[PDB]
Amino acid sequence: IINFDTSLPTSHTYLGADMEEFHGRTLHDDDSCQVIPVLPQVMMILIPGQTLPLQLFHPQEVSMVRNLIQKDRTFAVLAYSAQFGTTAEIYAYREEQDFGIEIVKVKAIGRQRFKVLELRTIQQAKVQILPECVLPSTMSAVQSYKWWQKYQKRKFHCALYSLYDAETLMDRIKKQLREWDENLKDDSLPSNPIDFSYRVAACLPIDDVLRIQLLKIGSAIQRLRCELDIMNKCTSLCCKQCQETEITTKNEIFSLSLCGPMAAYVNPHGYVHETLTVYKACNLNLIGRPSTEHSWFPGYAWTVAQCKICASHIGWKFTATKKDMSPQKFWGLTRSALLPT
Amino acid sequence: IINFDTSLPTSHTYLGADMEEFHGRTLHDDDSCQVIPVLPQVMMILIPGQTLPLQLFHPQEVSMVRNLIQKDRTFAVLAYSNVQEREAQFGTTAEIYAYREEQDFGIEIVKVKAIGRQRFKVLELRTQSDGIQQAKVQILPECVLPSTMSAVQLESLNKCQIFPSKSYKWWQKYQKRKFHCANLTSWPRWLYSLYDAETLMDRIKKQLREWDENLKDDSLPSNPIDFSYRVAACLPIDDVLRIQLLKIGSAIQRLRCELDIMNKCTSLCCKQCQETEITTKNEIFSLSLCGPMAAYVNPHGYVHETLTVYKACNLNLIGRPSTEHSWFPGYAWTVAQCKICASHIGWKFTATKKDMSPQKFWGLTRSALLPTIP
Amino acid sequence: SYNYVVTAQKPTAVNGCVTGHFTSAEDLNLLIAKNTRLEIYVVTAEGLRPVKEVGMYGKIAVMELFRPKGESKDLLFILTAKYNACILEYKQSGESIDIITRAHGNVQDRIGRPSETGIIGIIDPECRMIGLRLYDGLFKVIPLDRDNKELKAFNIRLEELHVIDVKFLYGCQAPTICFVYQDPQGRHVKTYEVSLREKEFNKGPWKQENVEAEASMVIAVPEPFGGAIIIGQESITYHNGDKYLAIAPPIIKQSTIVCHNRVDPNGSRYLLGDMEGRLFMLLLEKEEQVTLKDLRVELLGETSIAECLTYLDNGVVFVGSRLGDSQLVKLNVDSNEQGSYVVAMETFTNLGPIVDMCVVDLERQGQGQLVTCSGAFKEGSLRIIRNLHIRTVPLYESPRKICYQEVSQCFGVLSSRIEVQDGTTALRPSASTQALSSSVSSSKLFSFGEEVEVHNLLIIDQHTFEVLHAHQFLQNEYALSLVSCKLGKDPNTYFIVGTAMVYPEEAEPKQGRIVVFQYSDGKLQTVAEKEVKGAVYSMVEFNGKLLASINSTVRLYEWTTEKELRTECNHYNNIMALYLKTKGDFILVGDLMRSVLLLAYKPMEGNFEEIARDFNPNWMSAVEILDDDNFLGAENAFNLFVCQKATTDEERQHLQEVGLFHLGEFVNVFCHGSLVMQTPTQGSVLFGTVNGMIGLVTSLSESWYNLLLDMQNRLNKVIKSVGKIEHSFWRSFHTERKTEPATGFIDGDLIESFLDISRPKMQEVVANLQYKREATADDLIKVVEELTRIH
Ligand SMILES: O=C1CC[C@H](N2Cc3ccc(N4CCC5(CCN(C(=O)c6ccccc6)CC5)C4)cc3C2=O)C(=O)N1
Ligand SMILES: O=C1CC[C@H](N2Cc3ccc(N4CCC5(CCN(C(=O)c6ccccc6)CC5)C4)cc3C2=O)C(=O)N1
Ligand SMILES: [Zn+2]
Ligand SMILES: [Zn+2]
């Protein structure tokens, strides 16, 4: 039972209200080469459709973004396996002078995947916009279970093709996703294979070594296949520094925000953490005091949690600040500290 | 050159204003045995006369302090030889003198300022139901010794044992007239000067002046016991030496050991990797009237003994400058850590306003430092 | 530990002297307080006739004669350092003489720190009260009524904490005190009137004044002049109501004046004594209208450095000295020879201060003799003491350390003299400037009117005690230690001297030397010279090697076949190893703050490792190894202590104090030896003190310790102490911090007094005592005679 508002984390209100919302989408051509300013401090693999909050303080990046709001509000987040990358379009912007320095905090959203042709030193990346390899229905190339039996039978009456069909693969992934999104709404997930696969890739706790592989896949059918394969394979997560300490299991994963189990948030000093929300965690010591300052899930207070065998920060424990809320406690584990098994 | 108000750091303004302040004092008999509640999370070796700020948030600690403010305001701070496996033979009593209760960011927190009062030896430690230990401790006496010449001083020239208050010539005359009767013994005057409270205090001031360029004499206490404790509180020394100094009952022995430490210390190295030199004793300087080193509490109840230095080396700056909760008002801190081992060493403070003096300095946390002694 | 202390030689230094009519209304008497002894002489034309000698259970700190109304002869007030106050009378019935105690009490205050200027004690001229200054800001008044047998005293608070000196004024209608005090504004003279009925102070007869910045002596001038005289470093001033006089003679600026004495009952003539031994006469001029016309100072001459003066009669003056022999001199109207009016008549021996000593069998007859470095400055000398006969060898400079070399038949004496920067000029001919042969140190290593210490090593013949050789050390060099030993396998015997390089700008020495000299064929030859990075505080021969202390380090040196000192091992102690003693392979290390550290040398491992330790904060003046487990030391407040050396490491590594005693003397040196021809007593340790008293410590068996402790406890009940001080209070280990009873020590003087009591008293003491047989007087006489044999 969950009664928390799953649309609160997505707004990133810890960054402050009254942010100048930039409305209007910009896209490049499916082949055209481009020169894009690369942000040098984000060591993250952005995914199209994924939201990236940032807090920039360094003068060079502040000026870069300040001039970039006027022009196309697009910068480049490189993969840093830097061979591939994504283009992020700023859609919320603000400047302040909190605690001594001028600070620009923004919210961008990954737009397009590109290959790194060259980098010239704020770096400028000359990159190529990789297209989207969308395929037509295979069975049309040469021509609650009853509905799908009718599907797999009547649609493929011209006949394995079900294993590679976009609709059936999306339905299988959705079936495996309902375990997490207890409040799943059929309108919450997108209606096309492209956005669906991108969201699924965004919300998986897989290691970067496989996030890169998912990013470089150009076909939605293949991306869905790979996502399903990994979703089935992965079972438990362990402390990265130990590689021998299980912290949680895939059955404890749950989605407290509409973006999914995992999402990226900035802490007060600009460091981005991809936090995965889970019901239970093990082998973790709580350090310090509970605080609600700059909380990423409004209504909850965070307490630092670290592995009890090596004292490596694993994440935080969020505890409800008012009875009648559900869940009362959960754990937000940072991706960099977790290794799948 | 300096233009910073050195009285600002000691007021701990970052802990908020309008803190309820208590006057009066609670002192115990020099040999009496008492029972004192122990504050658990203090992994610090407190010294008498030293100021300890705290931000307590555990319900047990909050309740214990709330009870204390209605009784004698004194709790115990145990000098653990081992940070883990709590094992304390000595300690000191701290008396709360400022107090404020709040409920900031979801929980109730009590911020207090206490000051070390009396040393003691750990006779017994008992756990209690609430979780606040109670220590049975006997107060330790601060022995005072007369002048070494009081035993052999000739009666005829007793009346000459008063000097007109007041530099090399004056101290030469002071040695000549104060230890004239050293001729009756087997040791010379310059030997007894090495055990004189006044001469040792002056020799220590001659280095406190090297640190604090504009040191005012009136600030320092005018008796050897308080002077020795004040000097001990502000020396960047590891826990072993701090405990050794703590258990010295004599003010003359403490002054002599402090002088030896000041003379022998050469450089300060990163404790984790002992081979890298962070700074040198000649960079140390005093930004507050408490001394080069002082205890400050961070937003999450952690106490850091910060030593201020003019220049430091082998440090990487990480994150962003910030003036939030700054321990030195008007300056912005930046996390600094060893560039060989990436272990936190302290912060770099940079002045926000132009014309501030100094424009930059470093505050190094004591627990991460190791002084090298020849 | 069970020890036994006796006094071989009583104190000789004179700490006080007064003159009066004590024994009889006609007899002119001189009373001398030395340390614990009180000698009463009758002054005669032939000199002094010793009438009585008394022993006090305390150090006499105040001693005054006063005659209240109704008494035929003077009474004597004595305060001791432990604050035992007593009023005594001289009672005589035929040949029998004994000191009656007219009153007694203890005037200590439970709290309050002693004033740095020390105990002051004054008596009103009309004998209406006794005023004592023992603690700051307080003035203790003891009313002198006829029935205050307990000497009840009350305090009056003083607004002036730093009081220099204070006196009772003559001629005042009510008891008035004039005193000099110091505040930040300077030094002022003030007066108060004492109200016994109101128990307080009233405004004094005349106003407050301002005196010399270093005015430090007050003299009360009797009638008709009245008033007071303030004596300071530059000026002599006189105040009496509105009347005021001042002089600034130039003959007194060279040295401070520290003692005085009135020659005439009218105060027309006074004696003054300076720190360097000059005796002056201060004259007051009379005019009839009676008022004082003018002051003038005339130098009388040179005496031994005076601790006190007392004019007896017919121009004879007694000069009591602590640094030299006491003198009886004559004042002549006509100047003689250089121009001095002072002719020394008689001299009285004073062995104090005994700063070092040695035991030598000079005649080889198997009976030890003791050679001590006594005196200071122009009073320094060597004293040879044998079974008690004393021979003197003046040096006219300060001897510091002494050693004996039997092979070369000579003593090595470290000495120092004072020279004035003027090139530096010697103030007089002394031992080190009149040797038959002399040399000066030369090593590649390392204002006007100022005084500098020139150190020398003197080689002195054991037969004639002539200064055979004098070796002067480097400028600004302080010779500290001195040993005479054979090192390594070298057959030659050497003098080894450890030094330090002392610069006023440097608090702690950083450079020092160890110099190995050989004395042969009439010359002293520097054989080796090793530089070290500190002061060589002490040095001991150690199994043919050389153990030395350099600041906080204990270093071991070997004598290589090429005649050089080569380091063997170091031990870096936290304390300064001032005292360094050895026994077998054990080393005792001590510092000035009572820290004791027992280490052992490991012949196989070739290193030093700690055995035991005892760190207690207190001033320590000497140490000794009684045996392999017990260590004797001299501790602040004139005390002796004995530390002792479980199966647990934390316990075996701790020495425990098994003995405490209050000696009443400041012990400068210990040394193993004895002065008697060579039993219940095992061992022997002579010790020498500041006051010239030589004492002896031996060890006893527990059976004998208990027997003598019971004899002590039974003697205290029969022996009538003078001043009625209790022996247990007298001998209690006393420090300004605490007090404990004596433990582990037998007061041998009390025991030896057993032979002076009458036979009925012997029976009373010995009653119901078990020797298994019931002990009798004769058996205890045998015991005590055997005990007296040891010295
Ligand atoms: O819901 C949530 C979950 C929690 C999350 N939070 C809050 C937060 C606050 C602060 C910092 N800091 C990260 C950087 C920082 C580290 C500590 N500092 C030193 O000086 C220092 C460093 C080492 C030793 C001693 C002191 C100051 C700088 C402060 C990071 C975070 C963060 O992740 C959030 O925002 N909301
Ligand atoms: O002049 C000065 C000098 C600086 C000093 N300051 C400020 C400060 C601010 C915050 C924390 N923190 C210490 C504890 C803390 C650690 C970070 N946090 C995580 O969640 C987290 C932990 C690991 C990885 C990622 C995130 C929040 C909790 C925050 C410590 C300090 C501190 O010492 C001060 O006050 N004034
Ligand atoms: Zn781990
Ligand atoms: Zn390091």
CATH class of C354-704: mainly beta
Does B191 lie at the interface with C, CB-CB under 8 angstroms? yes
Question: Which residues is C540 bridged to in the sheet?
Answer: C547
Residue tagged 């004395």 (tokens): C519
Q: What distance in Å separates the CA atoms of residue C533 and residue C511, rounded to the nearest whole number?
A: 5
Chains touching chain C, criterion 3+ CB pairs below 8 Å: B
Q: Residue B57 Cα, ligand 2 centroid: separation in angstroms? A: 16
Question: Which residues is B54 bridged to in the sheet?
Answer: B112
C341 CA to centre of own chain: 30
Q: Can you read off the two tokens belonging to residue C281?
A: 């006469």
Matching fold, domains C3-348 and C705-788: no
Per domain, the residue ranges of chain C are 3-348, 354-704, 705-788
* C482: enclosing H helix or E strand: strand C477-485
Residue tagged 């299991």 (tokens): A249
Cβ contact B106–A269 (<8 Å): no
Cβ contact C690–B158 (<8 Å): no
Preceding peptide of C143 cis, ω within 30°: no
Instruction: Considering the domain delimited by C705-788, tell me its CATH architecture.
Output: Orthogonal Bundle (1.10)
Of C258, C638, C666, which is closest to B156 when you measure between CB atoms?
A: C258
Residue type for position A63: S
Residue type for position C134: L
Residue tagged 């290691």 (tokens): A207
Is A310 flagged in the annotation as binding?
Answer: yes
Cβ contact B320–A101 (<8 Å): yes
Chains touching chain A, criterion 3+ CB pairs below 8 Å: B
Task: Look up the CATH number of domain B12-139.
Answer: 2.30.130.40
- Determine contact, residues C40/C90, Cβ cutoff 8 Å: yes
Matching fold, domains B207-264 and B269-372: no
From the CB of B327, is ligand 2 less than 6 Å away?
yes
Give helix A220-233 / helix A208-216 axis angle, nearest 10°: 160
From the CB of B325, is ligand 2 less than 6 Å away?
yes
CA distance C668 to chain B (A): 6
Is A296 flagged in the annotation as binding?
Answer: yes
Q: Can you read off the two tokens belonging to residue C539?
A: 């040095």
Per domain, the residue ranges of chain A are 13-129, 169-234, 246-340
Instruction: Please name which ligand lies nearest the alpha carbon of B268.
Output: 4
Instruction: Please name which ligand lies nearest the alpha carbon of A337.
Output: 3
Angle, CA A318 vertex, CA A312 and CA A319 arms, to 5° = 135
Q: Residue A248 Cα, ligand 3 centroid: separation in angstroms? A: 13
Residues whose CB falls within 8 Å of the CB of residue C575, separated by 6 or more in sequence, listed in order: C552, C589, C591, C593, C595, C597
Residue type for position C387: N
Cβ contact A292–B57 (<8 Å): no
CA distances from C10 to C7, C151, C690, C692, C696 (A): 6, 30, 12, 7, 12
CA nearest ligand 1 atom 2, residue: A295
- Closest by CA to B97, choosing from B50, B45, B59, B141, is B50
Chain C residues with beta carbon closer than 8 angstroms to that of B252: 593, 617
Does B162 lie at the interface with C, CB-CB under 8 angstroms? yes
Rg (CA), chain A: 21
Residue tagged 């020890």 (tokens): C3
Q: In this complex, how many residue pairs, one in chain B and one in chain C, have their CB atoms less than 8 Å apart? A: 123
Write the DSSP string, B276-326. Answer: SEEEETTTB--SBTTBSEEEEE-TTS-EEEEEEES---SEEEEEEEE-TT-
Residue tagged 């930046």 (tokens): B334
- Determine contact, residues C190/C205, Cβ cutoff 8 Å: no
- Closest by CA to C275, choosing from C235, C232, C304, C317, is C304
Q: Residue A269 Cα, ligand 1 centroid: separation in angstroms? A: 7
Neighbour-count burial of B8, counting CB atoms closer than 10 A to its CB (0-12 exposed, 13-18 middle, 19+ buried): middle
b/e for A79-93, b at 16 or more Cβ within 10 A? beeeebbbbbbbbbb
From the CB of A304, is ligand 2 less than 6 Å away?
yes
Give the mutation target among B14, B105, B296, B300 for probing the ligand 2 site: most ligand atoms within 8 A of CB. Answer: B300
- Closest by CA to C507, choosing from B341, B288, B263, is B263
Cβ contact B106–A301 (<8 Å): yes
Chain B residues with beta carbon closer than 8 angstroms to that of A321: 106
CA nearest ligand 2 atom 5, residue: B298
For this experimental structure, what is the resolution in angstroms? Answer: 2.9
Cβ contact A321–B352 (<8 Å): no
Residue tagged 């991706």 (tokens): A335
- Determine contact, residues C473/C467, Cβ cutoff 8 Å: no
Cβ contact B319–A291 (<8 Å): no
From the CB of A153, is ligand 1 less than 6 Å away?
no
Cβ contact C355–B172 (<8 Å): no
Range 294-313 of B in CB contact (< 8 A) with A = 300-302
Does the domain at residues A246-340 carry the CATH identifier 3.40.50.150? Answer: no
Rg (CA), chain B: 22
- Determine contact, residues C381/C393, Cβ cutoff 8 Å: yes
Task: Look up the CATH number of domain A169-234.
Answer: 1.20.58.1480
C347 CA to centre of own chain: 19
- Closest by CA to C631, choosing from C662, C595, C665, is C595
Cβ contact B323–A100 (<8 Å): yes
- Determine contact, residues C286/C268, Cβ cutoff 8 Å: yes
Nearest CA in chain C to B177: C256
CA distance B238 to chain C (A): 17
Fold of A13-129: 2.30.130
CA distance B178 to chain A (A): 57
Neighbours of C341 (CB within 10 A): 19
- Determine contact, residues A245/A311, Cβ cutoff 8 Å: no
- Can chain B be said to touch chain A, i.e. do they have 3 or more Cβ pairs within 8 angstroms? yes
Q: Residue B315 Cα, ligand 4 centroid: separation in angstroms? A: 9
Positions at the binding site of B for (S)-thalidomide: 325, 327, 333
Q: Can you read off the two tokens belonging to residue C63?
A: 């001693």
Give me the sign of the Cα torsion angle B167, B173, B174, B179. positive
Chain C residues with beta carbon closer than 8 angstroms to that of B170: none
Residues whose CB falls within 8 Å of the CB of residue C265, separated by 6 or more in sequence, listed in order: C222
CA distance C307 to chain B (A): 6
Q: What distance in Å separates the CA atoms of residue C293 and residue C374, rounded to the nearest whole number?
A: 45
- Determine contact, residues B182/B188, Cβ cutoff 8 Å: yes
Residues whose CB falls within 8 Å of the CB of residue B327, separated by 6 or more in sequence, listed in order: B9, B14, B296, B306, B333, B363
From the CB of A300, is ligand 1 less than 6 Å away?
no
CA distances from C421 to C450, C452, C470 (A): 5, 7, 21
* B198: enclosing H helix or E strand: helix B197-211
Q: What distance in Å separates the CA atoms of residue C470 and residue C483, rounded to the nearest whole number?
A: 17
Q: What distance in Å separates the CA atoms of residue A284 and residue A247, rounded to the nearest whole number?
A: 8
Q: Which option is the CATH number for B269-372: 2.170.150.20, 2.40.50.200, 3.40.50.300, 2.70.50.60?
A: 2.170.150.20
Neighbours of B160 (CB within 10 A): 21
- Determine contact, residues B189/B175, Cβ cutoff 8 Å: yes
From the CB of B365, is ligand 2 less than 6 Å away?
no
Percent helix / strand / coil, chain C, rounded to 5: 5, 55, 40
Nearest CA in chain B to C357: B186
Give the number of residues written for chain B.
Answer: 374
Fold of B207-264: Methane Monooxygenase Hydroxylase; Chain G, domain 1 (1.20.58)
Chain C residues with beta carbon closer than 8 angstroms to that of B153: 118
Chosen from C59, C621, C624, C671 to mutate, greatest number of chain B CBs within 10 A? C621
Nearest CA in chain C to B190: C507
Q: What distance in Å separates the CA atoms of residue B197 and residue B321, rounded to the nearest whole number?
A: 45
From the CB of A154, is ligand 1 less than 6 Å away?
no
Q: What distance in Å separates the CA atoms of residue B339 and residue A79, rounded to the nearest whole number?
A: 26
Neighbours of C591 (CB within 10 A): 23
User: DSSP strand E in C13-108: where?
Assistant: 16-20, 29-33, 37-44, 47-55, 60-66, 75-80, 84-93, 96-106
Positions at the binding site of B: 270, 273, 325, 327, 333, 338, 341
Does A323 lie at the interface with B, CB-CB under 8 angstroms? no
Q: What distance in Å separates the CA atoms of residue C603 and residue C585, rounded to the nearest whole number?
A: 9
DSSP for residue C187: E
Cβ contact B155–C61 (<8 Å): yes
Neighbour-count burial of B9, counting CB atoms closer than 10 A to its CB (0-12 exposed, 13-18 middle, 19+ buried): buried
Chain B residues with beta carbon closer than 8 angstroms to that of A288: 300-302
Angle, CA A156 vertex, CA A154 and CA A160 arms, to 5° = 140
Is A242 flagged in the annotation as binding?
Answer: yes
Q: Can you read off the two tokens belonging to residue C282?
A: 């201060």
CATH class of C3-348: mainly beta
